[PDB]
Design an enzyme around this catalytic site. Structure first.
Site: not given
Ligand SMILES: Nc1nc2c(ncn2[C@@H]2O[C@H](COP(=O)(O)CP(=O)(O)OP(=O)(O)O)[C@@H](O)[C@H]2O)c(=O)[nH]1
Ligand SMILES: Nc1nc2c(ncn2[C@@H]2O[C@H](COP(=O)(O)OP(=O)(O)OP(=O)(O)O)[C@@H](O)[C@H]2O)c(=O)[nH]1
Ligand SMILES: Nc1nc2c(ncn2[C@@H]2O[C@H](COP(=O)(O)CP(=O)(O)OP(=O)(O)O)[C@@H](O)[C@H]2O)c(=O)[nH]1
Ligand SMILES: Nc1nc2c(ncn2[C@@H]2O[C@H](COP(=O)(O)OP(=O)(O)OP(=O)(O)O)[C@@H](O)[C@H]2O)c(=O)[nH]1
Lengths: 427, 426, 426, 427
Positions: D10, D61, D130, D134, D169, D196, D244
């Site tokens: 749910q 359900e 959640s 169940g 709940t 919640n 990342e």
């Molecule tokens: N002087 C500049 N510094 C930059 C720029 N873009 C990023 N950086 C700096 O260099 C740091 C790391 O360099 P990169 O953005 O190239 C990370 P990289 O692409 O090598 O690895 P992934 O993106 O995870 O594949 C980054 O945290 C910035 O501090 C830029 O356009 N100009």
């Molecule tokens: N934040 C948030 N929580 C939700 C929402 N809908 C359900 N919940 C949470 O879901 C919990 C119940 O988990 P479920 O296992 O999904 O309950 P169910 O699907 O009715 O399962 P049965 O009672 O066995 O039919 C509740 O305690 C809620 O806190 C929602 O829209 N927002």
């Protein structure tokens, strides 16, 4: 160069919504959130043709966050920045700190952390709160201590609203004020203060508003807090940085409690009849009734002062103005700092709100004066506290939060040590 | 030939330095873009003594502007002549000093001095023969006094044989736009007296006094004050930029004006200084401007020279004039003021003349003065330093950067040594 | 006459190699289609040293692009100049290395090396006289280090008398885009030191440092980095492509720069490197660019040369210039830096000059440097290799392709031999 | 280059119908089965102007197969690929494996065999299921073992949905999880995991979906599973292959259990107010509350990490971002792998679903981090299993299927050996 501004508590956010409308109007920012380097220190660039403030309105109580969300500035402010709590502080320093404070600071402390990472020129901090209650005392103090251990070196500009001697809103305010100042004394590099009754005096005799409200009070606060940062937003002949308020005003690392006052304050019909030049505003800012805090400077001595101007203000005449202030023997400077002046000039003029109570002026000044005049205010705040502390009034609430009688006495003797220093430095 | 490397430190130093390149560029006839459009051939003959030849007949200035805040360079770069300077020379930090000598000397300057020393090295090696360094800084603030003094010490050890020119504005008690000015002033003069062989002690209130009384301008801004101090910089460097009947190099001025190695703090001046309405009612002849030069009003320092005695004074004249009138005028000024000149020197007035006057004036002269009256400005800074230091006021901000209070006491001892030295020869 | 067979291995090698053919095609004046449209006759005189005459006056390059994935060639073939290369030279596998030295050296390369060795054989026999091989690869990844090193060993045994040029970029600790980079680096240098007579050790962070400080570009992409390293490839091969007053073949550079057979890992450079706005404020003369070549900023490797001493350096100048200025500039650089040059050699600076500069520049020069500072980059790769190898981390993927851990220990011993050799002559 | 993706249970098919709608929208494939080398790795060329996926949706359900047959993607998927069973698994690892599993695996194992013959560039596998029930435990584990003996060398990317510590709940889920992991430990080259309850946290604080469903959960899963294969579909500055993920993440052949997390996640109205650059997403992906699985990385150490980007993302600024992450001493990498980073760039931007909850953005990142933080999760899963194993709870169903107490103990000691390795490698 950049800076961030938070808001805490009712007093903070009522300043926040009132000051940020002024900030968006200066830079031509529409209320819908859009319209070069001037608005950068408060507003950011939101991609393209859109801005947002660097601020957060926090408060534990939700009464103040929802109206800003559904106000007129819905699109300007960020909706996630408008933080709201869950539980009220209830004018308790302990409750907004430990119980409610501990469950919400973890959201806002991490929020402003990552909000600084996108920033780069953070000069410091400036907060907006009030120790007259619980959120601005407990949650703010927990915020300052937990930020000083993290950053520490950066500056913090505290803008707290203290109560008047007789006028007040709460009834248990000195407990919140005395407890939070035990932590604010060491963690705050500088802390400007405002009173609630003095600011009514500003609008009564000068502006002639016989029925004002807190909306009108915050607009002139926005002129103050925006003027101190006006040098950073716009160029000037002599710019001053936000850190200049730490070196040129703090003679000792624990004496960092200056006053505040601002001029000119004049109504519309009086603006056209009154002449506006640097002389009377320099004579008016040192006037004791025109101060933002109820302290008589004639009783004390000035430790340090800084004058920052705005608009078309040449430097040759303002140097003559302060020379007339020095020879005036009404006020008196302390012998430990004869050169107690820091001049600042800015070309950008003071702006006005559409439909606001304040009139347009070609120039203005913001006077933040460091002095020992707050010592009698603290002793009066400590004096009224001793009457309630002796009867154990309003104690059962704080000890019911988790605290006890220990930090009550530690806050008392620490405040006594603050009085012992202000009388020693004023010799 | 005898290249001089310019350097601008601090807010005020960049402003007056910007005006210095503006006023001399009009004398040589350089456009704001950088191309030559002068009328005379002598303007281009000694253009290499500050500038460098570039492609398209462009001439870049050797101005290294240094400041611990960025907003200062934006105002200079956005000026009228801001586009001629090299962008590589605009090197600057971010956090300002906040008016603290310790920050610009230990923490904010130490991180920046390694970057600026590479800039002056390449500029000094590219020249034909280095003559000296022309510095513009302020004793107020932290970046001018702390970092501006520190780079000279690094340049002193690197170039001990070359002279060091420093046009240093310093505070005054009447006009004080900084609370922490005496600490920055007292610490800076300790470094200037040992390193710099030349120092022009300019005061701000005198420039306000000059613009108020003799010029009577209505609204003097900082730009008008820069025009006065920038003209004195162009006047001292006139003999090695244009021909003259009696040339006097910057080293020739040093040998005549520096009788002892520590007595190199002088009182500059400039003349004629006239209003727009009082020009028709004045003759441009040499005897009337000479007495204006020796007047207390024309001098750019608050110290009245009548409270002391001149050690040795220099008057670098400019324009076509009679040598007999120059030689007879320098006699009568010292004859009828023999009480204000030292008896243990037979002749104290140095003189020099050039053929090419400034643009817009037919004749002019620049006053440089060594006198014992300059100690009055040092002791008022000393008692301001002693008043704040005796209770350790405003020291905890300096100690945050690792600075000790012993260096404040050592600077106080040197400050006591300066005022006692000028009192010896009075 | 003296044909050089080009080879491009790995993703980065194809990119810089693609830029190498692009930049020299503009120097010779070749269209992307393959026809000649040059302005000078000397461009066509030595066009056969890389290209081959074909029908319709078309000139095909001798570029053998190799890669263990197909998508890399699609980007190169779909480039601006991708249509000039020969379709037969595009030889490539399907499964990538996945950044594994063992896959490209034992399994993925071994199945492909038989196909590519037939491509280089026919290209080498068709030439008049083979001179050497110009490789472009990277020590990172698996296809560049594993397969790119393997093909050189096959070319070494086939052509033992011919030289081997390798422009090899290598990782750095500050800029590392691969987890398994030190294993690929340590294993590759074991193969390079025995086979390659020439190796240009380029570092990526230096290219980032070069583009930031001296170029001050606003938005440097990988294509801008390729323009720097591609210019150095065109600069070394200038003397055998255009006339010059002092010609120096690639073998002539090898005899001068390779004092011992293992000390063939050099530090290339290129100058002038200026911004678009700082071109008007700069003179193109020879003394100012010479000090830029010996500066630590201009060099394309992270090792500061002031931490060591130069074994022997070469400066292949270009453009019409004064021979006395070239002969006097090479003297003063070694005189005032005698501590950074070995005393057991009387003159370490080789020099050469050409008459035809690059297109768009009047004068230029390329720096090739042998120094003991290059060992700093090897030991940081060594301690990274020793840190991961001492607990056998990430080795089980290498052992799947039949690789033993003894070869890792042998590469570690050679890595210890490299750093000790450069320390002997320091 | 090519790859095939099956779905079980749910949880699988509900991801399958949800992820394949995103794949067909990227390449401009209409839902009716028709519209050069970009869609070749997932979709085949069906003669002329028609395509078909390389996938199979299998479940015992029939509740889930019939709706896909009569859904909206009727013509896109092949009708014969949609396999349906006869009897329900009933959350029994044994029943979906032996009784019902053995009679249906013969159809699907021969189907994917001949489905690979028409393919030529099969890089590996990726499954979706959640272990919480169940079908995702029994039938999946039988599928993995029978595929590893046939192919073996090719990679397998498991995407299981594990339960939360307290949220769940089913009730007999650790029996299904512990029994199926005995077979999944050796046959899986890599297995990413999802929780919640954590994924609800992703949409709550950031996306502000106060009422989400499993449809909304699977759409952001589709962004994750499509991002890891985005390098193979479109060209990029630094392309990364599907292999990342085996070399740069698996330090040892039995330690192949990395985590997962993704950013940015932002709503529509918040997308325009928030700035989008590489800094905050690099700060946000390492945030512990923004993870897709409930594990505290501050307790553990990172073994290996890989960053893959999408859209307009230059390489000079992202290298500065990871440099700021390394000097930040909040997290800590293991000493056995200092260069624990793998950078990847792709020009094709992230797409959006029409009417989907996620907003459009100019750039994005997918952060799969290998660490030892799952060790405490497995020990907690083993801890809760020991309480039920001691009482022989839910054992009569499994032994009624055919099994016995032997593999119960073999799964226990095998899980104990998994804990013994994760504590040894983390030294
Ligand atoms: N002087 C500049 N510094 C930059 C720029 N873009 C990023 N950086 C700096 O260099 C740091 C790391 O360099 P990169 O953005 O190239 C990370 P990289 O692409 O090598 O690895 P992934 O993106 O995870 O594949 C980054 O945290 C910035 O501090 C830029 O356009 N100009
Ligand atoms: N934040 C948030 N929580 C939700 C929402 N809908 C359900 N919940 C949470 O879901 C919990 C119940 O988990 P479920 O296992 O999904 O309950 P169910 O699907 O009715 O399962 P049965 O009672 O066995 O039919 C509740 O305690 C809620 O806190 C929602 O829209 N927002
Ligand atoms: N004659 C002029 N004086 C200036 C000018 N600007 C400032 N000043 C004066 O020099 C005093 C201090 O010099 P600076 O403004 O340069 C303070 P500095 O830049 O060195 O330190 P920080 O700005 O705090 O980094 C200053 O208080 C002024 O009195 C100017 O443009 N012209
Ligand atoms: N000047 C000014 N003061 C304000 C304003 N708004 C609130 N205050 C002050 O804030 C004080 C109360 O502080 P708080 O801690 O923020 O009170 P609170 O946020 O209501 O905290 P609780 O009562 O616990 O919910 C009052 O005494 C007011 O004087 C305002 O807009 N302007």
């Amino acid at each position: 160069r950049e800076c961030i501004s938070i808001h805490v508590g009712q007093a903070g956010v009522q300043i926040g919504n009132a000051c940020w409308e002024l900030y968006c109007l200066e830079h031509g920012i529409q209320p819908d959130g859009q319209m070069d380097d001037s608005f950068n220190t408060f507003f950011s660039e939101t991609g393209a043709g859109k801005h947002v403030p660097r601020a957060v309105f926090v408060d534990l109580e939700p009464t103040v966050i929802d109206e800003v969300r559904t106000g007129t500035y819905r699109q300007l402010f960020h909706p996630e920045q408008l933080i709201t709590g869950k539980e009220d502080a209830a004018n308790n320093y302990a409750r907004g700190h430990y119980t409610i404070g501990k469950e919400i600071i973890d959201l806002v402390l991490d929020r402003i952390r990552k909000l600084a990472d996108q920033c780069t020129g953070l000069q410091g901090f400036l907060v907006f709160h009030s120790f007259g209650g619980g959120t601005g005392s407990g949650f703010t103090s927990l915020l300052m201590e937990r930020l000083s251990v993290d950053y520490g070196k950066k500056s913090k500009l505290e803008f707290s609203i203290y109560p008047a001697p007789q006028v007040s809103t709460a009834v248990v305010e000195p407990y919140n004020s005395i407890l939070t100042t035990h932590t604010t004394l060491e963690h705050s590099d500088c802390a400007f203060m405002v009173d609630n009754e003095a600011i009514y005096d500003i609008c009564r005799r000068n502006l002639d508003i016989e029925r004002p409200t807190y909306t009108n009070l915050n607009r002139l606060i926005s002129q103050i807090v925006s003027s101190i940062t006006a040098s950073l937003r716009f160029d000037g002949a002599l710019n001053v940085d936000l850190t200049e308020f730490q070196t040129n005003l703090v003679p000792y690392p624990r004496i960092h409690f200056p006053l505040a006052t601002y001029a000119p304050v004049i109504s519309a019909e009086k603006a056209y009849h009154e002449q506006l030049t640097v002389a009377e505003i320099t004579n008016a800012c040192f006037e004791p009734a025109n101060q933002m805090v109820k302290c008589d400077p004639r009783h004390g001595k000035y430790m340090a002062c800084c004058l920052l101007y705005r608009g078309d203000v040449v430097p040759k005449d303002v140097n003559a103005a302060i020379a007339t202030i020095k020879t005036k023997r009404t006020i008196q400077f302390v012998d430990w700092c004869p050169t107690g002046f820091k001049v600042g000039i800015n070309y950008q003029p003071p702006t006005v709100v559409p439909g606001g109570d304040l009139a347009k002026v070609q120039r203005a000044v913001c006077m933040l004066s460091n002095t020992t005049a707050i010592a009698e205010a603290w002793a009066r705040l400590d004096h009224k506290f001793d009457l309630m502390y002796a009867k154990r009034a309003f104690v059962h609430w704080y000890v019911g939060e988790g605290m006890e009688e220990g930090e009550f006495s530690e806050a008392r003797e620490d405040m006594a040590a603050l009085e012992k220093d202000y009388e020693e430095v004023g010799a | 030939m005898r290249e001089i490397v310019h350097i601008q430190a601090g807010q005020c130093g960049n402003q007056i330095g910007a005006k210095f390149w503006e006023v001399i560029s009009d004398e040589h006839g350089i456009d704001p873009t950088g191309s030559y459009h002068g009328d005379s051939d002598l303007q281009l003959e000694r253009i290499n003594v500050y500038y460098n030849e570039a492609a398209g007949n462009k001439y870049v200035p050797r101005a290294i502007l240094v400041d611990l805040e960025p907003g200062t360079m934006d105002s200079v770069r956005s000026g009228p002549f801001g586009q001629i300077f090299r962008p590589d020379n605009f090197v600057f930090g971010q956090s300002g000093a906040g008016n603290n000598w310790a920050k610009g000397h230990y923490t904010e300057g130490a991180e920046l001095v390694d970057s600026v020393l590479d800039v002056v090295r390449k500029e000094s090696e590219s020249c034909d023969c280095l003559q000296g360094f022309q510095l513009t800084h302020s004793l107020g603030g932290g970046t001018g006094s702390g970092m501006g003094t520190l780079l000279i010490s690094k340049i002193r050890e690197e170039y001990p044989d070359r002279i060091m020119n420093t046009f240093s504005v310093m505070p005054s008690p009447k006009v004080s736009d900084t609370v922490v000015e005496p600490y920055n002033a007292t610490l800076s003069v300790h470094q200037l007296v040992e390193n710099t062989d030349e120092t022009y002690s300019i005061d701000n209130e005198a420039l306000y006094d000059i613009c108020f009384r003799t010029l009577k301008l209505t609204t003097p801004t900082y730009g008008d004050l820069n025009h006065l101090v920038s003209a004195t910089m162009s006047g001292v460097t006139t003999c090695l930029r244009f021909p003259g009947q009696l040339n006097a190099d910057l080293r020739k001025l040093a040998v005549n004006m520096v009788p002892f190695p520590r007595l190199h703090f002088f009182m500059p001046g400039f003349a004629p200084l006239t209003s727009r309405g009082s020009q028709q009612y004045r003759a441009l002849t040499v005897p009337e401007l000479t007495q204006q030069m020796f007047d207390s009003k024309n001098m750019m320092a608050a110290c009245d020279p009548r409270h002391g005695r001149y050690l040795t004074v220099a008057a670098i004249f400019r324009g076509r004039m009679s040598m007999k009138e120059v030689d007879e005028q320098m006699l009568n000024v010292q004859n009828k003021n023999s009480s204000y000149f030292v008896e243990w020197i037979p002749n104290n007035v140095k003189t020099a003349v050039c053929d090419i006057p400034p643009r817009g004036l037919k004749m002019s002269a620049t006053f440089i003065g060594n006198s014992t009256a300059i100690q009055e400005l040092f002791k008022r800074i000393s008692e301001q330093f002693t008043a704040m230091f005796r209770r350790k006021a405003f020291l905890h901000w300096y100690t945050g950067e690792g600075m000790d209070e012993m260096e404040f006491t050592e600077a106080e001892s040197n400050m006591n040594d300066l005022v006692s030295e000028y009192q010896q020869y009075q």
